[PDB]
UniProtKB/Swiss-Prot annotation, chains A, B, C, D, E, F, G:
Cleaved in the C-terminal region by MycP1. The exact location of the cleavage sites has been the subject of conflicting reports. Likely translocated as a full-length protein into the periplasm, where it is proteolyzed by MycP1. Proteolysis may serve to limit the secretion of other ESX-1 substrates. This is ESX-1 secretion-associated protein EspB. One of its GO terms (biological process) is protein secretion by the type VII secretion system. Keywords: Acetylation, Secreted, Virulence. The keyword Cell inner membrane does not apply. BTP15, an inhibitor of ESX-1 secretion, decreases secretion of this protein without being bacteriocidal. BTP15 inhibits autophosphorylation of MprB with subsequent up-regulation of espA and decreased secretion of EspB and EsxA. The N-terminal region contains a fused PE/PPE homology domain. The C-terminal region is disordered. The chain holds residues 8 to 290 of 460 of the full protein.
Length: 242, 242, 242, 242, 242, 242, 242
């Protein structure tokens, strides 16, 4: 009718630990304020994800304890401002250039497939049928759907990190380089006779720079990834001693 | 009034096995990370689909047992970084080129029509009328709608595999070839006198390559196909012995 | 007060058979896999439609039996890979060219108007008023709305068949013809001196062909037409003998 | 307090017949299959509308009977395939050219204003107040809202007929004429020396014709106008004799 | 506690008549059928609006009677077809040109502000508090919201009339004039030698005319403005004599 | 436990009067009918806003009375038609040019910040805890949310007034000036030899004028701003004398 | 079973003060009315945010008191108008140029990460299980979600301040400068012979200025940030003395 050894094996398989989430620290792509705020937002989202994964591990431990109690119920168990322009270019180029975001996103994208790879422990029972088996299968299905949702959130956070890295690659491609602004400053200093000639160029260098930094403060504002807390396991009390 | 032989034949027809899902393994189109993650996502979705089809087979077995109990209730039964550019081109071309995705998708598209072809076993009864016949017809209709939804998910997974294959065909058409980058490197090495001439070409080769790989990391991120678990069959208990 | 002969005539008019659905078999437009899957999907949708129309005929028979019982309650009743390109063109042209889809869709579009033409049998009663007449009129109205929904699904299936036929007409207009590819192969074989001249043309023939077949695998994926099962007729038991 | 003569006059005004719906028969604009299916769809929608207007007349008769019972409660009452191209042009031009659709739509658009012109019979009472007067005013308001909805459906059916007529006017403006195709056939037959000259013209005549007929099979597919059945009148039983 | 003179003054202010709706009759802009149907639709909508405003006046009279009963409860109160083309132009120009629609819409737009200007009579009471005062304030608020909705419908009807007037101004600007068609007919009659020259012009005059009249039959189809019936006033019965 | 002096101070702070709404009268921008209707709509919306602010002041007075009763519960308290064209231009220019709308909108935009500046009186209590304190805090929070919604409506009305002013600035920029039409009339009168020359100019002056006035009658139709009535304060009855 | 020292430590950690919100005052970017209204709106939103953060601090104090009562339950605790144009330019340039908005937004963006950095105090308990522990964990989770929502609102207010600063940078880039208008006025005054030459330039200077100020009055209208009041802490009464 009911095989208790399957229940004990399923409890010891549910209680078994999953893989650890990655511990990569996403450093900022440059020294701009929007990039540092995006990197700190990714750090806080990763810490939130690890905290809720530990809470889900505790919920799986409580579910394994409830499965052991359900097994024990049956039987007996054992004028040109060149300074601001070249400062903006210098701040935009003095960083990791998104080489730590593409290593953060690869880890949190591999962890998505790692979390999807071991949802086999929440399968339904084979030889256990009854009214408690349906509730335990419902609890295991709730834990499985929560783990799949957490893997989806991990993939979304990896996509956010890749989006910030691609945005910094675009913002360093589009912005005028530091050495060109330094050369234009020496061209302005050496010969004032062309002050009516290179000043429309510099003004263009201003406007394009204002296009870049405005796009950086608008697009590198990440929304946080707050995960749902894990659903509570079923509480099956131990049977009273007769 | 009620013909029990029709009930026994319908139970033995519901319990009969359907066709097996295909066991093709979708290999990666190239050695990029997005293509390997897409291939692993397709492998995990296929494993999820096969697991839920086995669970549906067990639910059909329980429904056949309930139909046998309903039959037994009546009567007595028996400065140029050429290295990174040519590495990206080499990684993009060292693969199966989507020849295993188009064989995965053909199998999971034929399995869609195979699952739709044998929903005749969930038809309503002919000579059995009453109050248990309506509940058994409702259970058979629930199993039929679940099998049609599973066939729709199989067609969606085949469309995902075909989309990744078409994306890799586009990404190998658009990206600059490996031999052209190798020839441009020798053209850069043999004569530095044209270093102010072929460098705008190489820069274009950079930008187009950045257009391809950014499109590969954005478009080859598949969402998982999680199927619904099969609906529980009706439980008709055997009649008590008088 | 209540005329039983109207009830008997309405029961014998509801039980009268409607027109048969058409039995045309939609053959594939060509030998491509997407066209064969679309034709098999249309065959399965037509079989599903005919099965549910037979189930609705049985439900109308039960409703006529209930109307006869309601009448009996009152009184006493009686390097160029030319092979793959010319194989794709050959496979695209070796078919019925959508001449059997335009004969499938015409039949299932005439059956739409045929099903809408004979919903006069579900009209409300004239001389029968009371509390059972309202329930019988509600059952006849449910059957009428179900038959109108089935006619709408027949028109939708005919539109799907016409869409696949128009897609194949476009895909044979846009794809390069077989004889042109065969002539280009002989032009490539006879004189290699123009190998740097006709190869950009052939490459264009490749790309346009990839535009066609990708559009065929994406647009000729039909969704199935699963009809709702007919609503259950009211069950009016025969009166007990006094 | 309560004037029964107002109740009798309102019952005899509600029971008074409205204007008859028009009996124009929408003939097909041409001999194409889509135009004949659109004309048959308009015929079936007009028959459905007339049937539900007769049902609403019976419901108004029952409401007048209930108003008479409410009055009686108070006091005592008393290689070129030219054949298919010129066949398509001939079939497209051998019709009524939408001269019967513009006479169908004018009648069913005047009937919209005719149905809106005589909703004055469902006004609230003047000298009758109480608890039955509120229910009778609610029933008259339900009948008024149903008649206004039926007038809106009549205007929608007239708009469908005008849309099919405008579509046929466009499809005869855009398609190449029959006499031009007949002249091009004689130009092809008399001098084969220009077979490499007029054949790109004829091919254009093919493609434009395929643009027209595809637009005719897609746009002349009308959805049916199924009206709601009229809401049931309040049933006020006659008072018992003391 | 309760001042009955405020209740009597509020009843005599609620019963006071508002401004009359305007009695302008919207004549047709031209002799086309769509313009005459639009003008008749505006006439029917104005008659519906005046009928429901009279019904709301009767409801305000009943509310004033209920306020007087609530006051009395406390204390003791005291080959060219030129004929059809020039007929269409003649019919399009033989009208009032929308000079009566712009006088209809101005009246029904001033009546919107007139109805919004005197909702001060539905203000809440000052010295009357209790359990009947809350219900009387709820009834006055319901009447105020209904009057504001009726003013919104008056503004919508004025916008419909202005839309028909602007449509006729456009349709007389775009259509070819009558005198130009009459001059082209004399140019066709006097010299047949230019019959291959002015006939493409006349054909253009046909097509543009078909663009105008099709736009007139499609855009001048107004939907009716059916107002909601006024909400029933609270019925407070007079107190019984002790 | 409960400090009654805080309750008395909070009641005397809630009863304290806020700032008065501004009493600027928005005059019409010109003598057109749409501008006069927009100005009258703004006058009616401002009167509605002032009426509901007075009603909210009475509700705050009742809430202060309830807070005093809650304090007293604890302890013992103490052929060219130049005439119509130049008439339209004259009517369009004979006004205040939107100089009174930009002074209306500035007042009703400063009143938005004035209403948001003094919602500090609806703060929660400090030393008062219990079951009546929660209901009084809920009533104060309801009054605070209503005052913030009224400030939002004041900002919306100021935006409507600024929109009408900007529309009149555009409509006087785009319309042809009065002096130019007067000069064109004298140019038409002095020399008829150019009657085939300046008449296409005048026709353009017609069409552009029709573009302006149509845009004025369509865009200067304001919707009314009806505010919600203030939510009723909690009624705490005075305690009975022991 | 239950460790009371963990409860006392968690109460003293919840009651511990968080970081103070920043006290930067956003000054106006210029002397325009829209910029001053936007700066006053940011001041009022910051004051609202600080008030609700103080209210949340009081709610955390009440939650710590409830945790101390839950711990005490177990054991015993211890004709050119140049004047208006140059006035608009002067008013647009006489300000802080958005240098105080970019210091307001940096503070309120760092406070977002500061509020997200210390939500570790609302973690679930380790050694405390039971029926009161679940309610206390639910209250701590409600406070955590409210603090995360308040951090999201702080980031939204910082984005509003950065948007007003970028809008003023654009509006000073696009508007014509003060010195150019002053030079054009002297060019108009010194030589009237070019009055037909520089007047189309000045008119352009008018129109572009009207484009700027209209964009300033439309885009610098901020909506207020009203935060939700903090959710009420659970009230666990102290145990009665036995």
């Amino acid at each position: 009718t009911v095989d208790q050894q399957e229940i004990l094996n399923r409890a010891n398989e549910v209680e078994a630990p999953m893989a650890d989430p990655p511990t990569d620290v996403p450093i900022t792509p440059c020294e701009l304020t929007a990039a540092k705020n995006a990197a700190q937002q990714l750090v806080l989202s990763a810490d939130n994800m690890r905290e809720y994964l530990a809470a889900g591990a505790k919920e799986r431990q409580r579910l394994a304890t409830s499965l052991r109690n359900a097994a024990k119920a049956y039987g007996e168990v054992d004028e040109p401002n060149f300074m601001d322009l070249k400062e903006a270019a210098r701040k935009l180029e003095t960083g990791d250039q998104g080489a730590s975001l593409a290593h953060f996103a690869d880890g949190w994208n591999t962890f998505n497939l790692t979390l999807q790879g071991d949802v086999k422990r929440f399968r339904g029972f084979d030889n256990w049928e009854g009214d408690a088996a349906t509730a335990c299968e419902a609890s295991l299905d709730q834990q499985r759907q929560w783990i799949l949702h957490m893997a989806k959130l991990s993939a979304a956070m990896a996509k956010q990190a890749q989006y910030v890295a691609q945005l910094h690659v675009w913002a360093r491609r589009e912005h005028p380089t530091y050495e060109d602004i330094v050369g234009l400053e020496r061209l302005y200093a050496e010969n004032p006779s062309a002050r009516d000639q290179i000043l429309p160029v510099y003004a263009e260098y201003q406007q394009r720079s204002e296009k870049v930094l405005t796009e950086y403060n608008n697009k590198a504002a990440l929304e946080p990834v707050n995960p749902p807390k894990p659903p509570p396991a079923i509480k099956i009390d131990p049977p009273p001693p007769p």
